[PDB]
Each structure stands twice: as C-alpha cells, then as structure tokens.
C-alpha cells in the first residue's frame, strides 16, 4: 500500500522521463534469470546427494537450535529445502 | 617394595609399642566393612534400574569424552561398573 506513489512520477518534467528509461532495464533480467534458475538447480542435487547420511537431531546440539540462522550454522546440506 | 620398612619398628623402644598398639584397630574394621558392603550393594540396584534408558554416545558428547573424570561429568548412572 505504501508503493503506489510511484505511479504519480508521470505528472512532472524530472521524474517523468526517469520511469520511462526504468521501464526498459526491466526487459532484461528475464533471461540471465531463466539461465540463473537452471544453473542452481543443477547444483543444488549434487550436494543434497552427498551429505545426506550424517543428518543429526535437535536434541544432541548446542542450546537446541537446528539449522542455519542459528549462531553456529550447522545441518546446512540435509534437506532439499 | 618401599613399605617393608615397618618390619624394623620392634627393635627401638620408642616406635615399638606403638606397632603392637596399631595390629589391634585392624581387627575393628571387619564388620563394618561387612554391613557397608551390604548398604552399598543395596543401594547400587534401584539408582541403574531408573537411569538406563537415556544413555548417549561420545559423539554427541562435547570434546567425545564420555564418563566422570571429564571436565564436565555425564553418564554416571548407566552401566553397574
């Protein structure tokens, strides 16, 4: 609800023909992104394949924290997701 | 080897009364000995009957020590040894 001030740009002499020539860059990560989205997904099985036999529990770590975000990152390669 | 040092203790006035004096307390200790054996066997039953169903490995054990005689004490009551 906060964003729809940009779609008053087009009522003044400086900020009009910037929206214009923003418009356009936007036609071009479409690709290098379809290319990104297929280079990552190769990899990310690979590494999935490899690590998924030492997979530990919650319980057995330090202060019961799982996963990444935590203050020592660990369990990083067990899942898919 | 060292301590057969005692045996020269009857030929001086001063220290031999003293080792007649000690055989006799080592006839007081027996039947103690007999009655805390008995406590103690007692006693040694119930505490590893309640504690063996939470026994971990030494992997999950910081510094894989496992045991008392760590620095931090865990596993006391698992095992009867």
Same mark, same amino acid.
């Given at each position: 609800?906060? !964003?729809?001030? @940009?779609?008053? &740009?087009?009522?003044?002499?400086? #900020?009009?023909? $910037?929206?214009?020539?923003? =418009?356009?860059? !936007?036609?071009? @990560?479409?690709? &290098?992104?379809?290319?990104?989205? #297929?280079?990552? $997904?190769?990899?990310?099985? =690979?590494?999935?394949?490899?690590?998924?036999?030492?997979?530990?529990?919650?319980?057995?770590?330090?202060?019961?924290?799982?996963?990444?975000?935590?203050?020592?990152?660990?369990?990083?390669?067990?899942?898919?997701?």
């Amino acid at each position: 609800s906060s !964003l729809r001030l @940009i779609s008053l &740009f087009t009522a003044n002499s400086h #900020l009009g023909p $910037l929206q214009i020539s923003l =418009g356009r860059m !936007l036609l071009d @990560i479409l690709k &290098f992104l379809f290319i990104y989205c #297929l280079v990552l $997904l190769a990899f990310a099985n =690979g590494l999935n394949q490899l690590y998924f036999y030492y997979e530990t529990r919650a319980i057995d770590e330090p202060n019961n924290c799982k996963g990444i975000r935590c203050e020592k990152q660990n369990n990083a390669f067990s899942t898919l997701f």
